[PDB]
Amino acid sequence: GQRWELALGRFWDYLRWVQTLSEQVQEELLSSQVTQELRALMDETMKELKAYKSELEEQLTETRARLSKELQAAQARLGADMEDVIGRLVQYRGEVQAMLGQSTEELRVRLASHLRKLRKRLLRDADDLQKRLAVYQ
Ligand code: NA
Ligand code: NA
């Protein structure tokens, strides 16, 4: 229940909703609302993660150099994963526009499948980051 974990949980819950591609999700995917709201949740997660690492550094027991660089890489992966999710949802909005009003059912099937894989990567990187934070502490 760290602050950054709760922020990530809000990003994660929002994204689990987007994954359903329900009527209201689809509406908000063609405006900028889903990507704006996800970006705000991503920014909060990253801000809290940075502050948490900064506070952990106050209670630390060449090895330090390596672990700090490894932790930085794991944080950067989490942020890139969230950016990749947002970018795929921006791509969807453009794909829909290019259809000129034709059915988007196939685009939605493909988006759902790809989102599942992006979410798997985000979750595995979150778990790796949490493990490194626990061992850093
Ligand atoms: Na959830
Ligand atoms: Na389609």
Q: What angle do CA 49, 51, 54 make, to 5 degrees?
A: 110
Experimental technique, in short, is X-ray
- Tally of domains in the chain: 1
- 118 annotated as belonging to a binding site for a ligand: yes
| Neighbouring residues of the ion ligand 1, judged by CB less than 5 Å | 13, 16
99 CA to centre of ligand 1 in angstroms:
32
Measured from the alpha carbon of residue 9, the closest ligand is 1
Q: Would you say 119 is a known binding-site residue?
A: yes
Contacts of 31-35 with CB under 8 Å at 24 or more apart are 34/89, 35/86, 35/89, 35/90, 35/93
Q: At 103, phi and psi to the nearest 5?
A: -60, 135
Q: For this experimental structure, what is the resolution in angstroms?
A: 1.4
CA distance 9 to 13: 6
Q: In the block, which residue shows the tokens 């980051």?
A: 129
- The domain in which residue 4 lies consists of 1-137
